[PDB]
Amino acid sequence: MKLFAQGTSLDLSHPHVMGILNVTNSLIDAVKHANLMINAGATIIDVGGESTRPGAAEVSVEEELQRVIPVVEAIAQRFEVWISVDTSKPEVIRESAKVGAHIINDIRSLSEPGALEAAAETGLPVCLMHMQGNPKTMQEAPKYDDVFAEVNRYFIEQIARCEQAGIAKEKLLLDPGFGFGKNLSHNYSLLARLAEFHHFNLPLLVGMSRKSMIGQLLNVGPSERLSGSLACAVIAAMQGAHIIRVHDVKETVEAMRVVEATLSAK
Numbered sequence: 001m002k003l004f005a006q007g008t009s010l011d012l013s014h015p016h017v018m019g020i021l022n023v024t025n026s027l028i029d030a031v032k033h034a035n036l037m038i039n040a041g042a043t044i045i046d047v048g049g050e051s052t053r054p055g056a057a058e059v060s061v062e063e064e065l066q067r068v069i070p071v072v073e074a075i076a077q078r079f080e081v082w083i084s085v086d087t088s089k090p091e092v093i094r095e096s097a098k099v100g101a102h103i104i105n106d107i108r109s110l111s112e113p114g115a116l117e118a119a120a121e122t123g124l125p126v127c128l129m130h131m132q133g134n135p136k137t138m139q140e141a142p143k144y145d146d147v148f149a150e151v152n153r154y155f156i157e158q159i160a161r162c163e164q165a166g167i168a169k170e171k172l173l174l175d176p177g178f179g180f181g182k183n184l185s186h187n188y189s190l191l192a193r194l195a196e197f198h199h200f201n202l203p204l205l206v207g208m209s210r211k212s213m214i215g216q217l218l219n220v221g222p223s224e225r226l227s228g229s230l231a232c233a234v235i236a237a238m239q240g241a242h243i244i245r246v247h248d249v250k251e252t253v254e255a256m257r258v259v260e261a262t263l264s265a266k
């Protein structure tokens with residue numbers, strides 16, 4: 001199982017670590033941070049210029065472009081590392097793809113006007129992430145009769161939706177979107193059953209690093225969540241998750257090596 005973008009490949013026979021690069025000189029700090037994460041073992045750098053927090057004061061297209069496009073550009077013309085962009089906006093999708101982005105990672109699964117078509121036209125791999133509702137309001141009262149089933153259903157529908165717009169099944173990644181319209185129980189239900197999302201035969205991407213599913217369980221703030229975060233990463237990778245999105249790269253890469261050695265021996 002592989003992915004193809006910008007004339008190179010990503011080999012998903014083992015877990016990859018995705019380093020979070022939040023951009024909210026700005027440009028000099030970001031490149032350094034991307035460098036430190038590449039050295040630490042990160043093979044994808046995730047550039048994100050719009051807060052996805054439950055607060056959610058949305059940003060303009062011009063400001064998202066200002067924050068994201070120079071950073072993606074800088075990274076693609078130094079390093080060989082794959083680059084993913086956290087955007088919902090078709091112009092950011094178009095523009096970051098031109099300057100060398102490899103993966104469109106949209107928390108809204110290309111639901112914005114023109115986003116689906118803009119993604120189609122780039123030919124780049126697209127991540128389909130589940131969220132109930134939208135960021136402004138998703139956390140007030142998350143509710144499912146059956147969270148696994150509803151997330152499963154969501155991937156069926158979105159995979160079709162992307163196929164119909166001319167994006168090949170081979171381009172898609174799936175992500176049940178931990179913390180995106182989910183309480184603590186919902187999140188752990190999805191993590192315990194994550195291996196069952198393999199039936200789609202698509203790479204699974206997951207993102208639990210320092211999230212409330214650790215914070216609420218341990219009753220600690222965001223800087224005290226590393227052990228819980230590594231536990232979540234290992235639990236997911238043991239179930240065959242292909243990409244782990246994290247803040248703490250060195251520690252996550254160390255944990256993934258232990259998982260790789262374990263899965264080799266099976």
Ligand SMILES: Cn1c(SCC(=O)O)nc2c(=O)[nH]c(N)nc21
Pocket residue numbers: 048052053086105107127129175177178205206207208209211245
């Ligand atoms: C942008 N983005 C965030 S932002 C919130 C945070 O970093 O806590 N979380 C995720 C995630 O879980 N999956 C994917 N695919 N993208 C994500």
